[PDB]
Design a binder for these strands. Structure first.
Ligand SMILES: Nc1ncnc2c1ncn2[C@@H]1O[C@H](CSCC[C@H](N)C(=O)O)[C@@H](O)[C@H]1O
Length: 327
DNA sequence: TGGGGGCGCTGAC
DNA sequence: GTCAGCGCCGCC
């Protein structure tokens, strides 16, 4: 994550729904905002959240009375994506994990925050012939909010990961915000190899599979894209190897394959998956952030998370818009 | 709400 | 056909 000198969100309160690791919290707090409520039902996510912020998020949001949620200015929510991801079954709203947005709408209707800031996977934007996004849009408009949605790739914002996500920023209409803008892309000068840990700290992650098939030569020039170098097995998810001179593939939460949830990389002649700390860095998390003691849970948590830097630029722009109140 | 890994299909070229 | 995906499923 980056440093934010001008705290655009100072004095603003926000809630951290579907908190996970608290990526939205790091992002908004870096801009000066104050978190007044967090919600996350996963036992392990609650533990790591507590390790880093000192509070245990409240459980199952579908059972929380929206009237008991503290007043706030910005509602943050990177809601479940299994039901919308290109990697899943795409049952969408028909999925038990796909109706969480309506819980968000329920809370918004009641608390009417100034801003609603949501995130989901790229496929969310085209799911069900675009009907899914339209539904979110119409729901927000009905609740009297504007709707700004755009898919941003983390590689365009200083982080070496091809993580494409749709970000939805909504302003309550009475605020008449007409100048919100998604941050503009800039050249990437950081690649996977710049975030790796020393070899001595990741030796245990080195795997030597005799079914390894190198399909492309390593590149010596850094490039802002994923560069596949080979595969193991049939080359399915988690069985693909990439160059560290390129960018990281999208980290996942329930992913499988021998290089589960991070993908494999060629590092100093050997092939290995990423270490949880490297996952943190590829997600823009500061080294000061404490990862969960269970590596499997840590991989899952970062795989479900958000790239801090991207949210920071967006949060900064939300604040910039809110602060422009000329006479 | 465990931890590991083989998979197989979809979306967007 | 190319290829990558906050995933799925069954195993222990
Ligand atoms: N009913 C529910 N109540 C509370 N949390 C829920 C929930 N259903 C799913 N979740 C939580 O929703 C999260 C979605 S992933 C979002 C992660 C978050 N942006 C962070 O930065 O990491 C998961 O952690 C999941 O456990």
């Amino acid at each position: 994550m980056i440093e934010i000198k001008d705290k655009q969100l100072t004095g603003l309160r926000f809630i951290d729904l579907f908190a996970g690791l608290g990526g939205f919290r790091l992002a908004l707090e870096s801009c000066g905002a104050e978190c007044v409520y967090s919600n996350e039902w996963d036992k392990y996510a609650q533990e790591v959240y507590e390790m880093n912020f000192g509070e245990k998020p409240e459980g199952d949001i579908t059972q929380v009375n929206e009237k008991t949620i503290p007043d706030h200015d910005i509602l943050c929510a990177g809601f479940p994506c299994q039901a919308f991801s290109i990697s899943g079954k795409q049952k969408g709203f028909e999925d038990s994990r796909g109706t969480l947005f309506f819980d968000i709408a329920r809370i918004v209707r009641e608390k009417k925050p100034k801003v609603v800031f949501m995130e989901n996977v790229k496929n969310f934007a085209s799911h069900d012939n675009g009907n899914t996004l339209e539904v979110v849009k119409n729901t927000m408009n009905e609740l009297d909010y504007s709707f700004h949605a755009k898919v941003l790739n983390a590689l365009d914002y200083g982080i070496p990961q091809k993580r494409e996500r749709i970000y939805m920023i909504c302003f309550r209409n009475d605020l008449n915000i007409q100048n919100f803008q998604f941050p503009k892309p800039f050249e990437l000068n950081t690649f996977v190899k710049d975030l790796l840990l020393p070899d001595s700290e990741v030796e245990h992650l080195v795997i030597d599979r005799k079914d390894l098939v190198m399909t492309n030569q390593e590149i010596e020039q850094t490039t802002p894209k994923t560069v596949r170098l080979g595969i193991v097995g049939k080359g399915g998810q988690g069985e693909r190897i990439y160059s560290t001179r390129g960018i990281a593939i999208t980290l996942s939460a329930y992913g499988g394959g021998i290089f589960a949830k991070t993908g494999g990389y060629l590092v100093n002649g050997k092939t290995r998956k990423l270490h949880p700390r490297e996952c943190a860095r590829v997600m823009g998390y500061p080294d000061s952030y404490k990862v969960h003691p269970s590596t499997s849970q840590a991989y899952k948590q970062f795989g479900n998370s958000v790239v801090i830097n991207v949210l920071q630029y967006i949060a900064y722009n939300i604040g910039s818009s809110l602060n422009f109140k000329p006479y």
